[PDB]
């Protein structure tokens, strides 16, 4: 859905591979197609729902000892710890 009129939040449009993409400034990560935010390095209670990578967020998993994990967004597989479209 990235077009010539997409406004990349803390990023910029660039042609990568075939078409337009938002590329993040500095070391920010993609939280969606057009939004770049800060990448936390720990998934715990202090970072729940924060970006932990391109299209990945810290989630709280309900079991016994409650756990946290960096999970990809719907439509992506954590492949060698990198979210990539399914």
């Amino acid at each position, epitope marked *: 859905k990235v077009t010539v009129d997409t*406004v990349c*939040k*803390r990023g910029f449009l660039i042609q990568m591979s075939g078409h337009l993409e938002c590329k993040c*400034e*500095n*070391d*920010l990560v993609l939280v969606n197609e057009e939004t770049c935010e*800060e*990448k*936390v*390095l*720990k998934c715990d209670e*202090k*970072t729940v729902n*924060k970006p932990c990578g391109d299209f990945s967020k810290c989630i709280k998993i309900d079991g016994n000892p409650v756990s946290y994990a960096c999970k990809c967004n719907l439509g992506y597989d954590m492949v060698n710890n990198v979210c990539i479209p399914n």
Partner: antibody
Amino acid sequence: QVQLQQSGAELVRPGASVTLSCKASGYTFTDYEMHWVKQTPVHGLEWIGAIDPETGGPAYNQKFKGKAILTTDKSSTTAYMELRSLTSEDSAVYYCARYYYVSSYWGQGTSVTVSS
Amino acid sequence: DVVMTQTPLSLPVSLGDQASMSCRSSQSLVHSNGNTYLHWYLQKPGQSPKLLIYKVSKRFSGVPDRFSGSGSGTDFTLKISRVEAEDLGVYFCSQSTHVPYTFGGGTKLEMKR
């Protein structure tokens, strides 16, 4: 490109106030906080405070509470710092800066000279 | 407040030398999000400080690759692999982990003779 254009040099009588401006252009104004920083030879670089332009909410270094007042105006994409009741200790260069985890761009600075 | 201390105050060098500067913090700069928000700036006379390295070792866009930062917790180090004339100026470190954000006093990189 990203530009922070600060207002010109100020000459201020002791006890008066003055308002400095920082016009932001080349980026989405509400996506970054604005920081203000004071520089003097004696005290070096000092963080004055930060303002979130989406909400106008400021946060202040305790040292500058009551001395500085940060506002933002969305329509003009400008941050303001008002300095109140100026003394000779307020003579300095004042910078605004665009912040998101790091201040990547700074204004050119505003000279403030306090003298009667 | 976190106090940031830089050594040396003056770094005399000849062009082509390597340069190394220290920045120490009174408190760990590790953020609860895992990151370390320690940055380095260069300020030339009459100009604003310009970002060189952010988050300990990441080079800002457009910065020559002769600049590198390293360190962890409280001790940080900026290195210039080969000093050029455009590098003379005052190098400031600063932390944005803890409010209020604070800067070191600066290391001035100057010409030796």
